[PDB]
Coordinates of C-alpha atoms and ligand atoms in Angstrom, one line a residue:
Chain A
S1 CA -44.9 -90.9 -37.4
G2 CA -44.7 -87.8 -35.1
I3 CA -44.2 -84.1 -35.9
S4 CA -41.4 -83.4 -38.3
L5 CA -39.4 -80.3 -39.1
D6 CA -37.3 -79.4 -42.2
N7 CA -35.1 -76.5 -41.2
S8 CA -31.9 -78.3 -42.2
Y9 CA -30.6 -79.7 -45.5
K10 CA -30.8 -83.4 -45.9
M11 CA -27.1 -84.5 -45.5
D12 CA -27.6 -88.3 -45.2
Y13 CA -27.5 -89.1 -48.9
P14 CA -25.2 -92.0 -49.5
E15 CA -22.4 -89.5 -50.4
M16 CA -21.6 -86.1 -48.9
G17 CA -20.6 -85.1 -52.4
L18 CA -17.6 -83.7 -54.3
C19 CA -15.0 -81.3 -53.1
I20 CA -13.2 -79.8 -56.0
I21 CA -10.0 -77.9 -55.1
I22 CA -8.4 -75.8 -57.8
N23 CA -4.9 -74.9 -56.6
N24 CA -3.3 -72.3 -58.9
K25 CA 0.3 -71.7 -57.8
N26 CA 2.3 -71.1 -61.0
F27 CA 1.2 -68.6 -63.7
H28 CA 2.2 -68.2 -67.3
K29 CA 5.0 -65.6 -67.4
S30 CA 3.1 -63.4 -69.9
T31 CA 0.4 -62.8 -67.3
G32 CA 2.8 -61.1 -65.0
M33 CA 1.3 -62.8 -62.0
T34 CA 3.5 -64.0 -59.1
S35 CA 3.9 -67.5 -57.9
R36 CA 1.6 -68.1 -54.9
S37 CA 4.0 -69.4 -52.2
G38 CA 2.2 -71.2 -49.4
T39 CA -0.8 -72.3 -51.5
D40 CA 0.3 -75.9 -51.4
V41 CA -0.1 -75.8 -47.6
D42 CA -3.6 -74.6 -48.2
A43 CA -4.4 -77.3 -50.7
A44 CA -3.1 -80.1 -48.5
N45 CA -5.0 -78.8 -45.5
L46 CA -8.3 -78.6 -47.4
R47 CA -7.9 -82.1 -48.8
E48 CA -7.4 -83.6 -45.4
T49 CA -10.1 -81.5 -43.8
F50 CA -12.8 -82.3 -46.4
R51 CA -11.6 -86.0 -46.5
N52 CA -12.5 -86.3 -42.8
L53 CA -15.9 -84.7 -43.5
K54 CA -16.3 -87.6 -46.0
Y55 CA -16.2 -85.6 -49.2
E56 CA -14.9 -87.1 -52.4
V57 CA -11.9 -84.7 -52.9
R58 CA -10.4 -84.0 -56.3
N59 CA -7.3 -81.7 -56.3
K60 CA -6.4 -79.9 -59.5
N61 CA -3.2 -77.9 -59.9
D62 CA -2.3 -75.0 -62.2
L63 CA -5.3 -75.0 -64.5
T64 CA -5.7 -72.5 -67.4
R65 CA -8.9 -70.5 -67.7
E66 CA -10.0 -72.9 -70.3
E67 CA -9.3 -76.0 -68.1
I68 CA -11.2 -74.4 -65.2
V69 CA -14.3 -73.8 -67.3
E70 CA -14.2 -77.3 -68.8
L71 CA -13.6 -78.8 -65.4
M72 CA -16.6 -77.0 -63.9
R73 CA -18.8 -77.8 -66.9
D74 CA -18.0 -81.5 -66.8
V75 CA -18.5 -81.7 -63.0
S76 CA -21.9 -80.0 -63.3
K77 CA -22.9 -82.6 -65.9
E78 CA -22.2 -85.5 -63.6
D79 CA -25.1 -87.3 -61.8
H80 CA -25.1 -85.9 -58.2
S81 CA -28.4 -87.6 -57.3
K82 CA -26.8 -89.7 -54.5
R83 CA -24.8 -86.7 -53.2
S84 CA -25.8 -84.3 -50.4
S85 CA -23.9 -81.2 -51.4
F86 CA -21.2 -79.8 -53.7
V87 CA -18.1 -77.9 -52.6
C88 CA -15.7 -76.0 -54.8
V89 CA -12.5 -74.3 -53.5
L90 CA -10.6 -71.8 -55.6
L91 CA -7.1 -70.8 -54.7
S92 CA -5.6 -68.2 -57.0
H93 CA -5.0 -64.6 -57.8
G94 CA -8.2 -62.6 -58.3
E95 CA -10.1 -59.3 -58.5
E96 CA -13.7 -58.5 -57.7
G97 CA -15.8 -61.2 -59.3
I98 CA -12.8 -62.8 -60.9
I99 CA -10.4 -65.7 -60.4
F100 CA -7.3 -66.3 -62.4
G101 CA -6.5 -69.3 -64.5
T102 CA -2.8 -69.7 -65.1
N103 CA -3.1 -67.8 -68.4
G104 CA -5.8 -65.3 -67.6
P105 CA -9.1 -64.4 -65.7
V106 CA -12.3 -66.4 -65.3
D107 CA -15.6 -64.7 -64.3
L108 CA -16.8 -66.4 -61.1
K109 CA -20.3 -66.1 -62.5
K110 CA -19.2 -68.3 -65.4
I111 CA -18.1 -71.0 -63.0
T112 CA -21.1 -70.8 -60.6
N113 CA -23.7 -70.6 -63.4
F114 CA -23.1 -74.2 -64.3
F115 CA -24.6 -75.2 -61.0
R116 CA -27.8 -73.1 -61.2
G117 CA -31.0 -74.8 -60.0
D118 CA -32.1 -75.1 -63.6
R119 CA -28.7 -76.1 -65.1
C120 CA -27.6 -78.9 -62.7
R121 CA -30.8 -80.7 -61.7
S122 CA -29.2 -83.4 -59.5
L123 CA -28.0 -80.5 -57.3
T124 CA -31.3 -78.6 -57.2
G125 CA -32.3 -78.0 -53.6
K126 CA -28.9 -79.0 -52.3
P127 CA -26.2 -76.7 -50.9
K128 CA -23.6 -75.5 -53.3
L129 CA -20.6 -74.1 -51.6
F130 CA -17.9 -72.0 -53.2
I131 CA -14.9 -71.2 -51.1
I132 CA -12.6 -68.5 -52.5
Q133 CA -9.1 -67.5 -51.5
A134 CA -8.2 -64.7 -53.8
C135 CA -8.1 -60.9 -53.9
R136 CA -11.3 -58.9 -54.6
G137 CA -9.5 -55.7 -55.3
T138 CA -6.6 -53.7 -53.9
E139 CA -7.9 -52.0 -50.7
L140 CA -6.0 -52.6 -47.5
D141 CA -7.6 -52.7 -44.0
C142 CA -5.6 -50.5 -41.6
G143 CA -7.6 -51.9 -38.7
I144 CA -8.5 -50.2 -35.4
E145 CA -7.0 -50.9 -32.0
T146 CA -9.4 -52.2 -29.3
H147 CA -43.7 -74.9 -56.9
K148 CA -40.5 -73.2 -58.1
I149 CA -37.4 -72.1 -56.4
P150 CA -35.0 -69.4 -57.6
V151 CA -32.2 -70.6 -59.8
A152 CA -29.8 -68.7 -57.6
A153 CA -31.0 -70.3 -54.4
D154 CA -28.9 -72.7 -52.3
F155 CA -25.5 -71.1 -53.1
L156 CA -23.0 -70.1 -50.4
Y157 CA -19.9 -68.1 -51.1
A158 CA -17.3 -68.2 -48.4
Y159 CA -15.0 -65.3 -49.5
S160 CA -11.6 -64.9 -47.8
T161 CA -12.0 -61.1 -47.7
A162 CA -14.4 -58.2 -47.9
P163 CA -15.5 -56.8 -51.3
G164 CA -12.8 -54.5 -52.9
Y165 CA -10.0 -55.7 -50.6
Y166 CA -6.7 -57.6 -51.0
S167 CA -6.6 -61.1 -49.4
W168 CA -3.5 -62.2 -47.4
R169 CA -1.4 -65.4 -47.9
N170 CA 1.6 -66.4 -45.9
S171 CA 4.3 -68.1 -47.8
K172 CA 5.2 -70.4 -44.9
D173 CA 1.9 -71.0 -43.2
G174 CA -0.7 -70.7 -46.0
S175 CA -3.4 -68.2 -46.3
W176 CA -5.0 -66.6 -43.2
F177 CA -8.5 -67.6 -44.4
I178 CA -7.9 -71.2 -45.5
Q179 CA -5.8 -72.1 -42.4
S180 CA -8.5 -70.6 -40.2
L181 CA -11.3 -72.3 -42.1
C182 CA -9.7 -75.8 -41.8
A183 CA -9.0 -75.3 -38.1
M184 CA -12.6 -74.3 -37.4
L185 CA -14.0 -77.1 -39.5
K186 CA -11.7 -79.6 -37.7
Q187 CA -12.9 -78.3 -34.3
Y188 CA -16.6 -77.6 -34.9
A189 CA -18.0 -79.6 -37.9
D190 CA -19.5 -82.2 -35.5
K191 CA -20.9 -79.4 -33.3
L192 CA -22.0 -76.2 -35.1
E193 CA -24.1 -75.2 -38.0
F194 CA -22.0 -74.0 -41.0
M195 CA -22.8 -70.3 -40.7
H196 CA -21.7 -70.4 -37.1
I197 CA -18.5 -72.2 -38.1
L198 CA -17.8 -69.5 -40.7
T199 CA -18.5 -66.9 -38.1
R200 CA -15.8 -68.4 -35.9
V201 CA -13.5 -68.2 -39.0
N202 CA -14.4 -64.5 -39.3
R203 CA -13.3 -63.9 -35.7
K204 CA -10.1 -65.9 -36.0
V205 CA -8.9 -64.1 -39.1
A206 CA -10.0 -60.8 -37.7
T207 CA -8.2 -61.1 -34.4
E208 CA -5.2 -63.4 -34.8
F209 CA -3.6 -62.1 -38.0
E210 CA -1.9 -58.9 -39.0
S211 CA 0.5 -58.4 -41.8
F212 CA 4.2 -57.8 -41.4
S213 CA 6.1 -55.9 -44.1
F214 CA 9.2 -53.8 -44.6
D215 CA 6.9 -51.8 -47.0
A216 CA 4.9 -49.2 -45.0
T217 CA 2.1 -49.5 -47.5
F218 CA 1.6 -53.2 -46.8
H219 CA 2.5 -53.3 -43.1
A220 CA 0.2 -53.9 -40.1
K221 CA -2.9 -54.6 -42.2
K222 CA -5.9 -56.6 -41.2
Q223 CA -8.5 -58.9 -42.9
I224 CA -12.2 -59.8 -42.4
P225 CA -13.6 -62.6 -44.5
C226 CA -17.1 -62.3 -46.1
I227 CA -19.9 -64.9 -45.8
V228 CA -22.4 -64.6 -48.7
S229 CA -25.4 -66.9 -48.1
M230 CA -28.2 -67.7 -50.5
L231 CA -28.9 -70.9 -48.6
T232 CA -32.5 -71.7 -47.6
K233 CA -31.7 -74.1 -44.8
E234 CA -29.3 -74.8 -42.0
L235 CA -26.3 -76.9 -42.9
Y236 CA -24.7 -79.5 -40.6
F237 CA -22.0 -81.7 -41.8
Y238 CA -23.2 -84.5 -39.5
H239 CA -26.5 -86.3 -39.4
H240 CA -28.7 -88.2 -36.8
Chain B
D1 CA 2.9 -62.2 -45.8
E2 CA 1.9 -61.7 -49.5
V3 CA -1.4 -60.5 -51.3
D4 CA -3.3 -62.7 -53.7
Chain C
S1 CA -16.4 -67.4 -11.3
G2 CA -16.6 -70.5 -13.5
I3 CA -15.6 -71.1 -17.2
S4 CA -16.8 -68.4 -19.6
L5 CA -17.4 -68.3 -23.4
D6 CA -17.6 -65.3 -25.7
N7 CA -19.1 -66.6 -28.9
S8 CA -22.0 -64.1 -28.9
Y9 CA -22.2 -60.4 -29.0
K10 CA -23.0 -58.7 -25.7
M11 CA -26.6 -57.6 -26.2
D12 CA -27.3 -56.5 -22.6
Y13 CA -26.2 -53.0 -22.8
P14 CA -28.8 -50.6 -21.3
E15 CA -30.1 -50.0 -24.8
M16 CA -30.4 -52.4 -27.8
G17 CA -29.6 -49.4 -30.0
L18 CA -31.0 -47.3 -32.9
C19 CA -33.0 -48.6 -35.8
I20 CA -33.0 -46.0 -38.5
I21 CA -35.6 -46.6 -41.2
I22 CA -35.2 -44.6 -44.4
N23 CA -38.4 -44.9 -46.4
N24 CA -38.2 -43.4 -49.9
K25 CA -41.6 -43.5 -51.6
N26 CA -41.8 -40.4 -53.7
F27 CA -39.0 -39.2 -56.1
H28 CA -38.3 -35.9 -57.8
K29 CA -39.9 -36.0 -61.2
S30 CA -36.6 -35.2 -62.9
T31 CA -35.1 -38.5 -61.8
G32 CA -37.7 -40.5 -63.7
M33 CA -38.1 -42.9 -60.8
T34 CA -41.5 -44.3 -60.0
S35 CA -43.4 -44.0 -56.8
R36 CA -42.8 -47.1 -54.6
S37 CA -46.3 -48.3 -53.8
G38 CA -46.4 -50.6 -50.8
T39 CA -43.3 -49.2 -49.1
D40 CA -45.4 -47.6 -46.3
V41 CA -46.6 -51.1 -45.4
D42 CA -42.9 -52.1 -45.1
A43 CA -42.0 -49.0 -43.0
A44 CA -44.8 -49.6 -40.6
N45 CA -44.1 -53.3 -40.2
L46 CA -40.4 -52.6 -39.6
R47 CA -41.2 -49.9 -37.0
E48 CA -43.4 -52.3 -35.0
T49 CA -41.1 -55.2 -35.4
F50 CA -38.0 -53.4 -34.2
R51 CA -40.0 -51.6 -31.5
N52 CA -40.8 -55.0 -30.0
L53 CA -37.1 -55.9 -30.1
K54 CA -36.6 -52.8 -27.9
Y55 CA -34.8 -50.7 -30.6
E56 CA -35.1 -46.9 -30.5
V57 CA -36.8 -46.5 -33.9
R58 CA -36.5 -43.4 -36.1
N59 CA -38.5 -43.3 -39.3
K60 CA -37.5 -40.9 -42.0
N61 CA -39.5 -40.4 -45.2
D62 CA -38.5 -39.2 -48.7
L63 CA -34.9 -38.0 -48.1
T64 CA -32.7 -36.5 -50.7
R65 CA -29.2 -38.0 -51.3
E66 CA -27.9 -35.0 -49.3
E67 CA -30.2 -35.7 -46.4
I68 CA -29.4 -39.4 -46.3
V69 CA -25.6 -38.7 -46.1
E70 CA -26.1 -36.0 -43.4
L71 CA -28.4 -38.2 -41.5
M72 CA -25.9 -41.1 -41.5
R73 CA -23.0 -38.8 -40.7
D74 CA -24.9 -37.3 -37.7
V75 CA -26.1 -40.7 -36.4
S76 CA -22.5 -42.0 -36.6
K77 CA -21.3 -39.1 -34.5
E78 CA -23.8 -39.8 -31.6
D79 CA -22.5 -41.6 -28.5
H80 CA -23.5 -45.2 -28.8
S81 CA -21.6 -46.3 -25.7
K82 CA -24.7 -47.6 -23.9
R83 CA -26.1 -49.3 -27.0
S84 CA -25.6 -52.9 -28.0
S85 CA -25.9 -52.6 -31.8
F86 CA -27.0 -50.4 -34.7
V87 CA -29.6 -51.1 -37.4
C88 CA -30.2 -49.2 -40.6
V89 CA -33.0 -50.1 -43.0
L90 CA -33.0 -48.7 -46.5
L91 CA -36.2 -48.8 -48.6
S92 CA -35.7 -47.3 -52.1
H93 CA -34.8 -47.7 -55.7
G94 CA -31.3 -49.0 -56.3
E95 CA -28.6 -50.6 -58.4
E96 CA -25.7 -52.7 -57.5
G97 CA -23.9 -50.9 -54.7
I98 CA -26.3 -47.9 -54.8
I99 CA -29.5 -46.7 -53.1
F100 CA -31.5 -43.7 -54.3
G101 CA -32.2 -40.5 -52.5
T102 CA -35.3 -38.8 -53.9
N103 CA -33.1 -36.7 -56.2
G104 CA -30.4 -39.1 -57.1
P105 CA -28.1 -42.0 -56.1
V106 CA -26.0 -42.6 -53.0
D107 CA -23.1 -45.1 -52.8
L108 CA -23.9 -47.6 -50.1
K109 CA -20.2 -47.5 -49.3
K110 CA -20.5 -43.8 -48.4
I111 CA -23.3 -44.6 -46.0
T112 CA -21.6 -47.6 -44.3
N113 CA -18.2 -46.0 -44.1
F114 CA -19.4 -43.7 -41.4
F115 CA -19.7 -46.7 -39.1
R116 CA -16.3 -48.2 -39.7
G117 CA -14.5 -49.5 -36.6
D118 CA -12.1 -46.6 -36.8
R119 CA -14.7 -43.9 -37.6
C120 CA -17.5 -44.7 -35.1
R121 CA -15.6 -45.7 -31.9
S122 CA -18.7 -46.2 -29.7
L123 CA -19.8 -48.9 -32.1
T124 CA -16.4 -50.6 -32.4
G125 CA -16.9 -54.4 -31.7
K126 CA -20.7 -54.1 -31.9
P127 CA -22.9 -55.5 -34.7
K128 CA -23.8 -53.0 -37.4
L129 CA -26.7 -54.2 -39.5
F130 CA -27.8 -52.8 -42.8
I131 CA -31.0 -54.1 -44.2
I132 CA -31.6 -53.1 -47.9
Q133 CA -34.8 -53.4 -49.9
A134 CA -33.7 -52.2 -53.4
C135 CA -32.7 -53.5 -56.7
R136 CA -29.1 -54.6 -57.3
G137 CA -29.5 -54.5 -61.1
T138 CA -32.0 -55.8 -63.7
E139 CA -31.6 -59.6 -63.9
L140 CA -34.7 -61.7 -63.4
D141 CA -34.8 -65.1 -61.8
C142 CA -36.9 -67.5 -63.9
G143 CA -36.8 -70.1 -61.2
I144 CA -36.9 -73.9 -61.6
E145 CA -39.7 -76.2 -60.7
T146 CA -39.1 -78.8 -57.9
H147 CA -4.7 -55.9 -30.6
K148 CA -6.5 -54.5 -33.7
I149 CA -9.6 -55.6 -35.5
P150 CA -10.4 -54.9 -39.2
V151 CA -12.3 -51.6 -39.7
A152 CA -14.7 -53.6 -41.9
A153 CA -15.5 -56.2 -39.2
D154 CA -18.8 -56.5 -37.5
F155 CA -21.0 -55.4 -40.4
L156 CA -23.9 -57.4 -41.7
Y157 CA -25.7 -56.7 -44.9
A158 CA -29.1 -58.3 -45.3
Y159 CA -29.9 -57.7 -49.0
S160 CA -33.3 -58.3 -50.3
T161 CA -32.0 -59.9 -53.5
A162 CA -28.9 -61.6 -55.1
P163 CA -26.2 -59.4 -56.7
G164 CA -27.2 -58.2 -60.2
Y165 CA -31.0 -58.9 -59.7
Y166 CA -34.2 -56.9 -59.5
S167 CA -35.9 -56.9 -56.1
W168 CA -39.7 -57.3 -55.9
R169 CA -42.2 -55.1 -54.1
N170 CA -46.0 -55.7 -53.9
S171 CA -48.1 -52.5 -54.0
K172 CA -50.7 -54.0 -51.7
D173 CA -48.7 -56.2 -49.4
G174 CA -45.3 -54.6 -49.2
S175 CA -42.0 -56.1 -50.4
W176 CA -41.5 -59.8 -50.4
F177 CA -38.2 -59.5 -48.4
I178 CA -39.4 -57.0 -45.8
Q179 CA -42.7 -58.7 -45.1
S180 CA -40.8 -62.1 -44.7
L181 CA -38.1 -60.5 -42.6
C182 CA -40.6 -59.0 -40.1
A183 CA -42.5 -62.2 -39.9
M184 CA -39.5 -64.3 -39.1
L185 CA -38.2 -61.8 -36.6
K186 CA -41.6 -61.8 -34.9
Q187 CA -41.6 -65.6 -34.8
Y188 CA -38.0 -66.4 -34.0
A189 CA -36.1 -63.5 -32.4
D190 CA -36.6 -65.0 -29.0
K191 CA -35.5 -68.4 -30.2
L192 CA -32.9 -68.3 -33.0
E193 CA -29.5 -66.8 -33.8
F194 CA -29.8 -64.0 -36.4
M195 CA -28.1 -65.9 -39.3
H196 CA -30.6 -68.7 -38.7
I197 CA -33.5 -66.2 -38.7
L198 CA -32.2 -64.7 -42.0
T199 CA -31.9 -68.2 -43.4
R200 CA -35.7 -68.7 -42.7
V201 CA -36.3 -65.5 -44.5
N202 CA -34.3 -66.7 -47.5
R203 CA -36.5 -69.9 -47.6
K204 CA -39.8 -68.0 -47.2
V205 CA -39.0 -65.5 -50.0
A206 CA -37.7 -68.3 -52.2
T207 CA -40.7 -70.6 -51.8
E208 CA -43.8 -68.5 -51.1
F209 CA -43.5 -65.7 -53.7
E210 CA -43.7 -65.6 -57.4
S211 CA -44.4 -62.5 -59.6
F212 CA -47.6 -62.1 -61.5
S213 CA -47.6 -59.9 -64.6
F214 CA -49.4 -59.3 -67.8
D215 CA -46.0 -58.6 -69.3
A216 CA -44.3 -61.9 -70.2
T217 CA -40.8 -60.5 -69.4
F218 CA -41.8 -59.9 -65.8
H219 CA -44.1 -62.8 -65.2
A220 CA -43.5 -65.9 -63.0
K221 CA -40.3 -64.6 -61.6
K222 CA -38.6 -65.6 -58.3
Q223 CA -36.3 -64.0 -55.7
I224 CA -33.6 -65.2 -53.3
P225 CA -32.3 -62.7 -50.7
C226 CA -28.6 -62.4 -49.9
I227 CA -27.0 -62.5 -46.5
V228 CA -23.6 -60.8 -46.4
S229 CA -21.9 -61.3 -43.1
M230 CA -18.7 -59.8 -41.8
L231 CA -19.8 -60.4 -38.2
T232 CA -17.3 -62.0 -35.8
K233 CA -19.9 -63.4 -33.2
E234 CA -23.3 -64.9 -33.0
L235 CA -26.1 -62.4 -32.6
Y236 CA -29.2 -63.0 -30.4
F237 CA -31.7 -60.3 -29.9
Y238 CA -32.4 -61.7 -26.4
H239 CA -30.1 -62.1 -23.4
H240 CA -29.8 -64.3 -20.2
Chain D
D1 CA -45.9 -57.0 -58.2
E2 CA -43.4 -54.2 -59.1
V3 CA -39.5 -54.0 -59.2
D4 CA -37.5 -51.6 -57.1
Ligands
NA301 NA1 -6.6 -65.2 -46.6
NA302 NA1 -38.3 -57.9 -51.8

């Protein structure tokens, strides 16, 4: 045949892959964590959005830290040989590097380590996407008026917010990040490379949202999401 | 609006 | 006029902008930090590479922590109104979130905070790029065989390595990351959007480099760089 | 090869 290029991940395996959505709304009272109003809107939007991208979606609700770890372990031990990619969405309370089970925290590292190039061989060389709607701390953005590969390769973290910052969720509409992400995937997944879709998401969250609160501390605040890419190729959800 |  | 789109940063200001290169090779003996052999190769390559992208390059060598902070403060207080962007390259020892002056550590946050949307108004809305060749910890990758905007918006961090990991520098050839970055900029800056250039850099570092050491602990190790984007638009170094 |  003629000249070939390999600048993009192979996304024409028989299956696009799994999309695991962990939707933590209700937390054990002893943790002192609030109910996450609006997160069901997020979970439903994600399910439909990734369904239409032809992902095998599994929704899980209100998982303990133990259940999250066993779920991730089990999923990483499935045979993904006929799958192009893997997607995990985490909707919960969080801190920097941490997501909450209903009864306490899980290190994100513990979750993502299961999918290392050396620990999940049927996903080696394939994009592994972690989409995280959770706080990464307590900072508020006041805004301004205008032969081997690394085991850590081929991960992408789409964080809802910058390191150290709160992340915003609307109880009626869903989280700023997830609602923007689904919108941009709906509009552009048949048109743009994934980093460029996520960049549109950054702009949408940055420009169209601002918090409203009776509490001065929490009023008129802004958010920028944070794309963290260890990918080695371009990612298009479609194929020729 | 609420924080996570 | 006809229909317009604004998905890409305006890069046709009279000037592309500054490229500040901080090249720390020699450290005060009391710090116990080694001389960074090969870093001059990096600094020279960066200077030439960004010169050809039409950046106003300033090279600075062997700066104390105090000099780094005063340099960044002063640069952020310049008038960047006629400049499209800002680039800062840091070549030094480091740990997670930290870069070393010749006499001790500087928080990266302290450096980047000067350029916040609210603190450097002539760079508000413009891409601010921080390119960092330094360790982010001590992990080794064993590999596997095959009306307002946020003040934190419009930053891009091109890290040489994944969070928590060592970063590799060759004493003869320069660092894996910087040599790959310059190569991909030379080849693709007139062709590809910046995230796609950096993705080529990820692949090059991931596939073409592996450490050689007489010390088993440090032998046969791999590296993946880490793109952290808070940008809100696509970035092309050229313009129509 | 050396680490930073
Ligand atoms: Na959000
Ligand atoms: Na490097």
